[PDB]
């Protein structure tokens, strides 16, 4: 039983973290993650801050796709002082959300398929990123969510990448769909784990692909009637084979079905930028009020307890992969050195939602 | 000429691993000591060859079959040792 | 105890010095100007002619002249 | 308020000797190699730009440290001791960045922690801005003529027990 | 003169494959810079430079004399097996009557040098590590030795001139891709995945000149194995379908090695790592049965030779 | 490259103001630096990408101003200058000249680099060794534009 | 000629030290790395015998099959304990006679005397001139029946050692 | 005869003291119990003695006619019979 | 883990068997390592006063549980002390490192 240290620069790169095990042998059987790496103290300081200057701080939790965090966190205070977006402008967050769960989940698969190569997804990441720059204007350090909807307006020639992203995008990702039936060392190295279905999945606490893994369609959007998710065309991933493999295919039906929204998306256009706007400087109210949003690793979600006062008087996050790491401690009992990679890789977590 | 010096050695190493034979606190010391014996005869085989036996290499043939039977005899004998590393605790 | 050759001198230093200066400024000629004007079986073929012909390469690569104008600029140094 | 150095002279003053120094100090400009040190934000940047910890001298710290993670840090700066030095790529380890006031677990810059060359504005610049930070750093090694290979240790210590109460 | 004439192929040896291992270095920079999009030459050495001039790094264990001799028999484990390689029909560093004998027991003295370096280095990281290298080393010898078999069976010789001239007789169809591609598959399974490339450390502790051995080493066992790759099946000198045979038969066998070479990144690039469990799935139950297959069929070939 | 000649010493021991032309090609500027370093002197860094007013920066004492994080007060205190407290950090006596390193071009306004050399002939011991606007290959001018 | 016998002289030395590295260290790993450096000098000297086959197969199989689980055994540190394992008393005094009557036995013999003698057997027929041939004829036929008892001794050996280092 | 391996000696030493001498330029200037590891080389040591065996018949397999090949038929027939016994049992398990 | 320690600029704890700079295995023994970058000129008698005002003041602040509160506490306090005790003159600056960065503020002209 030769104790694994875990140390800070793992052999792969999806964050700093421990992962102490006994490993009799080379059979891991017992976890105990230690946490508290990428630390920031979100709730104290942003108890301390104002919504518009903890507006600038979300952007360290999923950085991967960061319009999930700032639009979670706009859309608490439009719900909480009931101010209408008017449909343009929420259906153009739609897309842009949307656009940010295609990239995570596609800067998901790239490391994992480094791990177990770059350029390979940099050529669509390059008119990706330049989609980001001609959406707001940075990389993924976006600041551009008000209560009435974007900042800014969308440019002329964003319309026409959106527009051409579908047949810049789709085929490339159906080129890359065959590889795991082609390809058996997919069928070898990482077929098997995730041996967890959907009545224990319900049970612990997941959410994201690990809930979808089992043939659950399940939805926050769905089932909270939120920006008109019944209009456009919907699959959520009821896919029943549970293992890792089934989570690729869940994250390529995500992906797939994103790619649907947003290409009935294209034409639609039902809505000004800012609706409610007189003055710079506003304030919240006191209500008890849990916003939730569907993550792309399953139910994001903002506690808030207000102060009616500049500063929130509560301000606690549920992240969602930081309840989807409780499950590994079971997810550890019977596999290797060799199947960590592929476990840490199929939790799809980075570290900064983690401790925060 | 000093060609014979060669098997000066070869009982030099035949003294030394006998020694190391004999005191031996564990046994894959003791081992390794009844390997250099094997290499000292082994040596010795080549060096006959190499002297008086050219056209049949009936010393260095000897010396191949040796060094197989010394593989042999050094795979059982670790794991005799293995199986003791094994049934201890 | 054979001496086929009986040549004392300038029969492969004069080989030596033609590999050693001719070729190379036109093997790195032909690598830049044909960078991207390649198929992947011209890129093959040139990595395997780089890979053949490197240690004449020793005297052309600190120096580096005729590398840099994508305009019609003036040395406005 | 400064020390006063020694300076006597350069002993290594032949044409050979400053030859394959300068050689030696332009191929040690130019070999970088960095065991690129990610996993946070400066992450980012090593897919458009090895594993031993005690190799790759020329190591930038493009992450944001913290108070926990600076044991292992001044170990890992330990496992680089005499050669080269650590170029600062992040707001945090220069200020704490964008927590510089508040934050209780992260370090105000590792300015107070390891000795740093290149101070960067901070938060993911342009994949270039690495290229000129080791420009700069090849500039600042190439004014390096090895310090004429001159050397001093402190070794201050106590050999009176501490007054312990462990667990 | 009792002397010089009999060092001049050794250094020019030497200094050839320091610049083999340079094109080694640039070429898998240079596949990297193709699949991941001058001054470049010259920052190989710059990296060889980088590596050579460094700290000592020793700690406080007492093994000192391994601790130095470690990399060191990792060095010569490929650089003694370099008098091997036939590059034309001279310029040979020895006749060399066990032509890839020497070499099949050069390149199993590595092990040697993996348990020296996971002896030598005082970390649990580096001795689990030299355990996985000197493992693999081991386990991936006998289909490798197996397929160098069949081929001085296919020769019936084991001196490397010999069988570079063997492959010469049918024309390019004499060649040993068409005598055993299956051979051929094992020859590149056994080149690719030994040197610790095509799957996956182990230098926690080694560092300054003992990590630019084990660099050298590695990329000099990859120049090796790729040379034997020309000399066993590609051919040496011959493209049938005085002083310059010599001079051509030198670029014929590069252009066979840059060949291997490229294969060889490329197939590591588009490879991922065997994760430790088919590495010996392959390399025990289903490589080494197969390589006796296929060396029990060249047996059963050669009654009609 | 490499070409051997101290002619760039020649030009700091005699014009003391030169742009130095040279590429982001790695690190082929600091050898003349090394050669000053060299010869008994001590070689400091500046850049100009952020110095403004720079005769009001290198004496006169310019003023601190710690940031406060929005807890402490403006503490309007008075840092020592540039190459005053430079000049005051040179210990030895055998240190000839202090080389002023300056590696920024851009940003710099035409008159404000005239300034700044003309307070390299203010103290006999600075050297002004800024940048050149990166050329491609080594070109040592003079400061005549400036 | 000089430079062959000087290092025979050079090979015998280092083996010897290399030999009492194996007996007499207080590491088993330092006996075992010796014991490699020693098989390392045998494969030279079998260089130095003209036996060049029987240099690269001792060469290949008894550092590189055999010590490499040697050291694997011995890394793996398991337990401790007239001609038998009495000593301090015994293996002195038979080791010095013995050695003794070794050394009176090689020393006191013209070998090269032997060697002019039976010349007619080693006069290395025409036709074939080659090492590993010979080997290969004089072993596959005519030393027909300890070649094909080997196959079995290894086949028992390997099933044996299959039956007992499992449990 | 000291004419084949006569440049190969030299070749040794310089070899042997560049390492050695690359040290002195360098210090110049500037518990597990895993034994699975252990069984895949306890089989490639008698598989290794047994490739020992098959190489200089297969060097003088040209001079003599089927009767060699027979010899070696047998014996490799005892190598895989062993490693076919390595197939059914808890040989490699790997 | 095993390493036990509050290491800073000036002040490193490393309470391990270090008597000489080879590090090991972990101990009571609270080895001082003082001024890792070459910050400050540190002369041996002003070493020594540190030193020893870093043993009173482990030796006054111990008798409560020594965990890693008390070795931040006692980390800092001994930075303000070397502050305090450069800001005197006591401690110089050294200009012999490649940063030379005035860790502690220019000495003003008052
Ligand atoms: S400064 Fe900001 S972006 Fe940079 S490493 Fe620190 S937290 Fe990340």
Not at chain 5, 206 to 234: E, H, R
Not at chain 6, 113 to 140: D, T
Request: charged share 15%.
């Amino acid at each position: 039983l030769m104790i694994v240290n875990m140390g800070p620069h793992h052999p792969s790169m999806h964050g700093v973290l421990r992962l102490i095990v006994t490993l009799d042998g080379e059979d891991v059987v017992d976890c105990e993650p230690i946490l508290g790496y990428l630390h920031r103290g979100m709730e104290k300081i942003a108890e301390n801050r104002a919504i518009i200057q903890y507006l600038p701080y979300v952007t360290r939790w999923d950085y991967l796709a960061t319009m999930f965090t700032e639009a979670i966190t706009v859309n608490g205070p439009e719900q909480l002082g009931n101010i209408q977006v008017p449909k343009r402008a929420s259906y153009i967050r739609v897309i842009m959300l949307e656009l940010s769960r295609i990239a995570s989940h596609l800067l998901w698969l790239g490391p994992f398929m480094a791990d177990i190569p770059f350029f390979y997804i940099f050529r669509e990441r390059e008119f990706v990123y330049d989609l980001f720059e001609a959406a707001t204007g940075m990389r993924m350090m976006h600041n551009f969510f008000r209560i009435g909807g974007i900042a800014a307006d969308l440019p002329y020639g964003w319309i026409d990448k959106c527009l051409d992203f579908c047949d810049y995008f789709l085929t490339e990702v159906v080129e890359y769909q065959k590889l795991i039936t082609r390809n058996p060392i997919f069928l070898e190295r990482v077929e098997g784990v995730g041996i967890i279905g959907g009545e224990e999945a319900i049970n612990w606490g997941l959410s994201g692909p690990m809930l979808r893994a089992s043939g659950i369609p399940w939805d926050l959007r769905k089932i909270d009637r939120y920006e008109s998710y019944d209009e456009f065309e919907w699959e959520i991933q009821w896919q029943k084979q549970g293992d890792s493999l089934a989570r690729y295919l869940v994250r390529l039906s995500e992906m797939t079905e994103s790619i649907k929204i947003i290409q009935q998306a294209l034409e639609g256009l039902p809505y000004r930028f800012i609706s409610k706007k007189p003055s710079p400087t506003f304030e919240l109210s006191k209500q008890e009020l849990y916003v939730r949003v569907e993550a792309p690793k399953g139910e994001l979600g903002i506690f808030l307890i207000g102060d009616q006062s500049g500063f929130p008087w509560r301000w606690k996050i549920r992240p969602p992969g930081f309840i989807n790491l409780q499950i590994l401690p079971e997810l550890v009992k019977r596999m290797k050195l060799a199947d960590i990679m592929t476990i840490l890789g199929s939790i799809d977590i980075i570290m900064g939602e983690v401790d925060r | 000429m000093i060609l014979e010096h060669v098997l000066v050695l070869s009982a030099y190493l035949f003294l030394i691993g006998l020694y190391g034979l004999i005191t031996s606190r564990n046994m894959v010391r003791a081992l390794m000591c009844l390997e250099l014996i094997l290499n000292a005869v082994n040596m010795n085989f080549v060096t006959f060859s190499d002297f008086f036996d050219n056209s049949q290499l009936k010393g260095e043939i000897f010396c191949i079959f040796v060094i197989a039977i010394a593989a042999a005899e050094a795979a059982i004998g670790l794991a005799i040792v293995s199986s003791i590393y094994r049934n201890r605790k | 105890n054979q001496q086929e050759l009986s040549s004392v001198v300038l029969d492969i230093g004069i080989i030596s010095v033609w590999y050693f200066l001719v070729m190379p400024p036109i093997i790195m000629n032909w690598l830049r100007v044909r960078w991207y004007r390649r198929k992947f079986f011209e890129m093959y073929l040139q990595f395997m002619f780089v890979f053949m012909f490197f240690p004449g390469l020793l005297l052309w690569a600190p120096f580096l002249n005729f590398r840099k104008f994508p305009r019609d600029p003036n040395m406005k140094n | 308020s400064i020390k006063f150095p020694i300076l006597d002279r350069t002993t290594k003053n032949s044409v050979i000797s400053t030859t394959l120094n300068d050689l030696s100090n332009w191929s040690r400009l130019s070999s970088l190699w960095p065991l690129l040190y990610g996993t946070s934000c400066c992450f980012i940047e090593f897919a458009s730009l090895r594993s031993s910890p005690r190799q790759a001298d020329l190591i930038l710290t493009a992450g944001t440290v913290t108070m926990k993670m600076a044991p292992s840090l001044v170990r890992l700066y330990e496992q680089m001791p005499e050669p080269k030095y650590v170029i600062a790529m992040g707001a945090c380890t220069i200020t704490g960045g964008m927590f510089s006031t508040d934050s209780y677990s992260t370090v105000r810059g590792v300015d107070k922690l390891i000795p740093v060359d290149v101070y960067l504005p901070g938060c993911p610049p342009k994949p270039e801005a690495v290229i000129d930070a080791i420009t700069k750093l090849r500039k600042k090694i190439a004014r390096e003529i090895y310090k004429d290979r001159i050397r001093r240790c402190f070794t201050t210590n106590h050999k009176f027990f501490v007054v312990r109460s462990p667990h | 003169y009792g002397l010089i004439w009999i060092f001049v192929p050794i250094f020019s040896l030497v200094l050839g494959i320091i610049t083999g291992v340079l094109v080694i270095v640039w070429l898998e920079r240079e596949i990297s810079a193709g699949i991941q999009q001058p001054l470049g030459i010259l920052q190989a050495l710059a990296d060889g430079t980088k590596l050579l001039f460094k700290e000592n790094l020793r700690p406080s264990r007492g093994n000192t004399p391994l601790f130095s001799i470690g990399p060191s028999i990792a060095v010569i484990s490929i650089l003694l097996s370099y008098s091997v390689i036939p590059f034309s029909n001279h310029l040979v560093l020895a006749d060399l009557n066990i032509g890839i004998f020497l070499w099949i027991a050069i390149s199993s003295i590595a092990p040697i040098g993996l348990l020296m370096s996971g002896y030598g280095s005082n970390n649990k990281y580096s001795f689990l590590g030299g355990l996985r290298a000197a493992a693999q080393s081991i386990s991936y010898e006998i289909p490798l030795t197996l397929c160098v078999l069949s081929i001085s069976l296919l020769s019936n010789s084991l001196s490397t001139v010999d069988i570079v001239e063997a492959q010469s007789k049918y024309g390019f169809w004499g060649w040993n891709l068409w005598r055993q591609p299956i051979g051929f598959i094992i020859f590149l399974i056994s080149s690719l995945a030994e040197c610790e490339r095509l799957p996956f450390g182990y230098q926690t502790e080694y560092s300054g000149i003992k990590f630019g051995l084990f660099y050298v080493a590695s990329y000099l066992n990859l120049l090796i194995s790729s040379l034997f790759v020309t000399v066993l099946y590609l051919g040496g000198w011959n493209i049938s379908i005085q002083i310059f045979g010599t001079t051509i038969g030198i670029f014929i066998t590069l252009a066979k090695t840059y060949l291997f070479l490229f294969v060889s990144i490329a197939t590591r690039w588009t490879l991922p790592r065997l994760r430790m469990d088919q590495l010996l799935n392959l390399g025990w139950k289903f490589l080494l049965p197969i390589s006796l297959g296929n060396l029990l069929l060249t047996t059963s070939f050669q009654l009609f030779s | 490259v490499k070409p051997d000649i101290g002619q760039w010493l020649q030009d700091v021991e005699e014009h003391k103001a030169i742009a130095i032309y040279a590429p982001h090609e790695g690190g082929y500027e600091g050898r003349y630096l090394n050669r000053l370093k060299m010869q008994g002197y001590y070689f400091l860094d500046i850049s100009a990408r952020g110095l403004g007013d720079p005769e009001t920066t290198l004496l006169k004492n310019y003023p601190v101003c710690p940031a406060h994080l929005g807890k402490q007060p403006i503490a309007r205190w008075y840092y020592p200058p540039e190459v005053d407290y430079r000049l005051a950090a040179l210990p030895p006596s055998a240190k000839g000249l202090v080389v002023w390193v300056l590696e920024a071009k851009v940003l710099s306004k035409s008159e404000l680099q005239f300034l700044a050399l003309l307070p390299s002939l203010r103290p006999n011991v600075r050297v002004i060794a800024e940048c050149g606007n990166w050329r491609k290959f080594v070109w040592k001018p003079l400061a005549e534009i400036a | 000629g000089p430079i062959h016998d000087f290092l025979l002289v050079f090979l015998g030395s280092g083996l010897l030290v290399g030999g009492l590295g194996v007996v007499l260290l207080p590491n088993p790993i330092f006996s075992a790395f010796s014991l490699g450096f020693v098989l390392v000098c045998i494969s030279l000297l079998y260089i130095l015998s003209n036996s060049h086959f029987v240099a690269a197969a001792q060469l290949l199989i008894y550092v590189g099959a055999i010590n490499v689980l040697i050291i694997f055994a011995v890394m793996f540190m398991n337990d401790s304990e007239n001609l038998w394992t009495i000593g301090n008393g015994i293996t002195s005094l038979v080791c010095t006679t013995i050695l003794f009557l070794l050394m009176s036995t090689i020393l006191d013999t013209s070998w090269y005397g032997v060697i002019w003698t039976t010349k007619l057997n080693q006069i290395l027929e025409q036709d074939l001139i080659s090492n590993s041939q010979q080997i290969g004829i004089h072993l596959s036929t005519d030393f027909f029946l300890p070649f094909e008892l080997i196959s079995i001794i290894l086949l028992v050996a390997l099933i044996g050692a299959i039956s007992v280092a499992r449990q | 005869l000291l004419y084949e391996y006569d440049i190969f000696w030299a070749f040794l030493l310089i070899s042997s003291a560049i390492p050695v001498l690359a040290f002195l330029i360098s210090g110049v200037l500037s518990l597990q119990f895993r034994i699975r590891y252990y069984m895949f080389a306890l089989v490639f040591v008698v598989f290794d003695v047994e490739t020992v065996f098959l190489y200089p018949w297969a060097m003088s397999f040209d001079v003599l006619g089927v009767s060699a090949f027979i010899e070696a038929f047998i014996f490799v027939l005892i190598l895989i019979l062993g490693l076919v016994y390595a197939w059914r049992k808890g040989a490699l398990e790997w | 883990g095993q390493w036990l320690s509050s290491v800073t600029r000036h002040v490193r704890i490393y309470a391990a068997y270090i008597d000489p700079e080879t590090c090991e295995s972990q101990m009571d023994k609270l080895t001082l390592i003082l001024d890792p970058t070459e910050e400050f000129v540190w002369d041996d008698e002003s070493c020594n006063k540190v030193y020893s005002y870093f043993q009173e003041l482990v030796d006054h602040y111990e008798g409560a549980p020594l965990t890693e509160y008390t070795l931040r506490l006692i980390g800092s306090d001994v930075e303000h002390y070397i502050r305090k005790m450069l800001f005197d003159g006591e401690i110089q600056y050294n200009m012999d490192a490649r940063v030379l960065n005035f860790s502690m503020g220019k000495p003003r002209v008052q």
